[PDB]
Amino acid sequence: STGSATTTPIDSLDDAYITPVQIGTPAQTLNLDFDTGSSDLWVFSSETTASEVDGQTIYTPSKSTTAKLLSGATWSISYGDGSSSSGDVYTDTVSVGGLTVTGQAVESAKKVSSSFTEDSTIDGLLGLAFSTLNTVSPTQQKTFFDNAKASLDSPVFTADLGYHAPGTYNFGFIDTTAYTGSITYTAVSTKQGFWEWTSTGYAVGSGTFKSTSIDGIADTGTTLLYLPATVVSAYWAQVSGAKSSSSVGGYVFPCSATLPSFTFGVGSARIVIPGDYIDFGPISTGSSSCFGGIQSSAGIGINIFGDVALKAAFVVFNGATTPTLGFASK
Ligand SMILES: Cc1nc(N)sc1-c1nccn1C
Ligand SMILES: Cc1nc(N)sc1-c1nccn1C
C-alpha cells in the first residue's frame, strides 16, 4: 500500500503545515501537524476543555463506530516552545492520503496549552519520530508510520514541504518526479528517538564551504533552523544591522535587507536554502525589525533542521531495519 496527502502552510510565513487526516467511521477529517520530532498522534476532541477550544475541528469518538476507549491509558506531552497537551486514548481507524491503519492510538486531548488554543488551524499532531518517544502510559503506543510500515510497498515516508505553497507527504514510495538530481542518504541514530543525523558543514551565501560535523534532527514540527551559535553568528554577520535581541528572543534583522542563502552539507551533497526562506517578517505588526529563520540552538541541547531547512529539499525518512535519511534538491 501507499498514501499521498497534500500539506499546506497555516499562514503566510509557513509557521507550520497542516495535512488532512481521516479518523473514525464515518470519517472525521482533522487537519494535523505532521511532526517528525515527536511520536504522539493527538487531537482536539469532544473531551477537550471547552474554554481551550477556539475554532479547531474536534474528533468525537462517540460518533465513530470503530472507536474504542483504550482503557486506563493516558498521555501528556510538552514541546520545545513550552507548549503542552494531555488526555486519554482511543483506538480507531486512521487514514492519510488513502493509506489506512486500523487500531491506531488516537490520543484525545482533555487539556491543551494556550498556544494550541490560539492556533485555530491546527486540530492536533501526528508524530512521525520513533515510537520509543510515545508518551502513552502505561502501555506505550506506536506511531501511524510504525503501524503502517509492514503494509507499505517500501518502509519509507517522504516530506516535500513548500515555500509559501502546498507540498506533499508520501508513504510507501519515492516519487522520482518530485526532486532533481540524485538522493544522498546519510546515517541516522535512533538513540534519542529522533531522526538524528550529522550534516557535513555549511556555507553562507556565496562563501566557501566549511567542513564541520553538525549533529541534529530532521524535524518537520519545528518552524526554524536551529544551529550552533558559531554557525548562526557567521550567517548573521553577513547581514547589515542584524543582531541578537534578548528582548525579542533571537536574531532580528532590518526588514530592508536582502538575506543571503545558507547551504548545508549532506555527505558530499549540498542543499541550498534561499535567503527568502530565512525571512520570518516583522517582529510585530508594522515593525521594521524582522525575525530571522536561522537561530541559535544554544540552550536547546540539540540542533534542529526544522522547516526552513527541510523545505529546501525532498526528504526521505527511510524506516528500514537500519533507518537512514535522504536529501535531494528540488
Ligand atoms: C512548537 C511546537 N512544536 C511542535 N512539534 S507542535 C508545537 C506547537 N505548539 C503550539 C502550537 N504548535 C504547532
Ligand atoms: C528579507 C529577504 N531576503 C531575501 N533574500 S528575499 C526577502 C524578503 N523581503 C520581503 C519578502 N522577502 C521574502
Give a verbal description of the structure.
The protein is globular, with a radius of gyration of 20 Å. By secondary structure, it is mainly β. The longest helix has 8 residues, at 229-236. It is built from 4 helices and 24 strands. A hairpin with a 5-residue loop joins strand 12 and strand 13 (210-218). It has helices at 114-117, 144-149, 229-236, 307-310, and strands at 3-9, 17-23, 28-35, 41-43, 68-78, 84-96, 99-112, 124-127, 156-160, 167-171, 184-187, 196-204, 210-218, 225-227, 243-245, 250-254, 262-266, 269-273, 279-282, 289-292, 294-296, 303-305, 314-318, 324-328. The protein has 2 domains: 5-174, Cathepsin D, subunit A, domain 1 (Beta Barrel); 175-330, Beta Barrel (Cathepsin D, subunit A, domain 1), CATH 2.40.70. The strands form 3 sheets. A 7-stranded mixed beta sheet has the order 18-17-12-13-22-14-21. The structure holds 4-methyl-5-(1-methyl-1H-imidazol-2-yl)-1,3-thiazol-2-amine (46P) (2 copies). Residues 16, 33, 35, 37-38, 79-81, 83, 115-116, 119, 122, 125, 221-222 line the site of one 4-methyl-5-(1-methyl-1H-imidazol-2-yl)-1,3-thiazol-2-amine (46P). It is classed as hydrolase.
